[PDB]
């Protein structure tokens, strides 16, 4: 099948390049640019700021272009500067001169990754229902492409921490290739505003601010709470990646059947089910008395991504007009998720020193669980009452 294999490999090489960036970036500020941990807490503070004006902006374009590949050409274009840009540019620019200067160059990302990954999901999702395949399939490539790269940052990470990057930049042109050969064949922004008054959006978004925002904040300190469960910080962390590397293959496998499970259960129960494993993981983390537990727990993450990613599209397409699938994705499951993730992540911090972890997480469960349970009724569609 023409589109399936091209855009399936597209996810493979796209998320491979998140590979270099995702778990490696903090290291490359940490070690290779000797920047201080007191400076990297601002860099992230900017990479998100820009994204806040790229994510909605990418949503309207990703619909107005429809199946036109122009917006995905820009991304594949910017991704090619992976290699010259950190080596050539993002490297010298904040060291000799005030970081505040190079911090802007950080916008690179905001564009490519934080606000560009979901634009790749959404676009390939639209193609996913003009060809004959399921979005969960092919998207499953993302996990294995992230797993493949995930194993390589650490291994050559101590022999040539410039190839990981260089390797990523190379895959960007492979990404240009697959974008070209693949062959694939509305609204106005004032009709787009109509959705923001429609009360069916405020319920879906509510679910995101409630369940998904709470989940993506939690999974923020988790690591710091997992390392404490092994002897030495290095032995503890070492085990972590292994969980991440190994559990993503399950996730990819889980995603493989995901769309079959998703297609009948229906969209709403897909999100409710996703909300449940996120809720259980939030409250479960509080009751921790052993690692073999904090491992399991990290694995559930792979049990909640399949449904969520696949499920949200089934929801958005099923209950909303498809003339807005990219927009209400990049505004609800991305924009509104990140906008609220500024604020909790504050709150969580205060809770720790106020109620440590145990006491904090416990709260997340009720909040995450409460909202999950509430969205059996705020979300329109068929609840779990049907089966």
């Amino acid at each position, epitope marked *: 099948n023409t589109n399936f294999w091209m855009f399936g490999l597209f996810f493979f090489f796209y998320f491979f390049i998140m590979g270099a960036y995702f778990p490696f970036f903090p290291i490359w500020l940490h070690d290779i640019n000797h920047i201080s941990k007191s400076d990297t807490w601002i860099i992230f503070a900017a990479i998100s700021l820009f994204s806040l004006l790229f994510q909605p902006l990418f949503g309207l374009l990703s619909d107005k272009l429809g199946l036109r590949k122009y917006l995905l050409w820009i991304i594949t274009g910017m991704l090619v500067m992976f290699a010259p840009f950190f080596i050539f540019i993002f490297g010298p620019l904040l060291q000799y001169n005030i970081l505040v200067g190079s911090i802007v160059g950080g916008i690179y990302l905001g564009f490519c990754f934080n606000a560009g990954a979901p634009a790749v999901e959404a676009f390939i999702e639209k193609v996913s229902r003009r060809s004959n395949f399921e979005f969960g399939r092919a998207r499953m490539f993302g996990c294995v492409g992230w797993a493949l790269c995930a194993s390589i940052v650490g291994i050559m990470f101590t022999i040539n921490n410039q190839f990981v990057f260089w390797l990523g930049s190379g895959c960007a042109l492979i990404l240009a290739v697959l974008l070209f050969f693949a062959k694939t064949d509305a609204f106005s922004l004032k009709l787009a505003l109509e959705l923001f008054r429609q009360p069916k959006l405020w319920f879906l978004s509510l679910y995101v601010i409630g369940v998904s925002c709470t989940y993506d904040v939690f999974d923020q300190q988790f690591a*710091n709470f997992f*390392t404490s469960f092994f*002897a*030495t*910080g290095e032995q503890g962390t070492r085990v972590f990646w292994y969980v991440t590397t190994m559990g993503e293959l399950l996730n990819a496998s889980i995603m493989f059947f995901a769309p079959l499970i998703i297609n009948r259960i229906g969209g709403k129960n897909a999100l409710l089910l996703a909300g449940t494993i996120m809720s259980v993981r939030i409250i479960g983390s509080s009751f921790a008395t052993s690692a073999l537990e904090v491992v399991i727990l990290k694995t559930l993450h792979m049990f909640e991504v399949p449904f969520l990613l696949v499920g949200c599209f089934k929801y958005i397409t099923s209950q909303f007009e498809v003339r807005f699938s990219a927009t209400i994705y990049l505004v609800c499951f991305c924009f509104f998720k990140q906008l609220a993730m500024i604020f909790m992540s504050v709150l969580a911090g205060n809770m*720790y020193e106020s109620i*440590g972890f145990q006491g904090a997480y416990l709260v997340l469960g009720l909040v995450a669980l409460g909202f999950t349970l509430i969205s059996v009724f705020t979300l329109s569609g068929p609840g779990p009452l049907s089966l």
Partner: nanobody
Amino acid sequence: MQVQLVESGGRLVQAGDSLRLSCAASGRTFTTYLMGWFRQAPGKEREFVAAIRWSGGSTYYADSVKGRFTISRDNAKNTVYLQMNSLKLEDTAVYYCAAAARPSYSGDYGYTEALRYDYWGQGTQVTVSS
């Protein structure tokens, strides 16, 4: 945050004898998620001794002290113990309790890493005779 830990115990003891250290915690009762004993002499550094986690009571001890020491707790009255048997001569050094509670940035620390805990107690020296 200010919770605080108070050690008791320690005294002179003869090679082969016993001691019982206790560590009270004034504030605590939600935060500290894990308690440990660490010791320090001269010559060398802070050395991990034993760790335990309130909820559940799972214990860990750095090899050099297994079977010889027992770390226990008793929530019920904000206190963690170290029962030290078969003492030796090397076993002389200031013993500290420490408790965890909040997180803290870097490449993360584990259950033997001193830098890992968010709080400490003053001390109570322990001298085992030659």
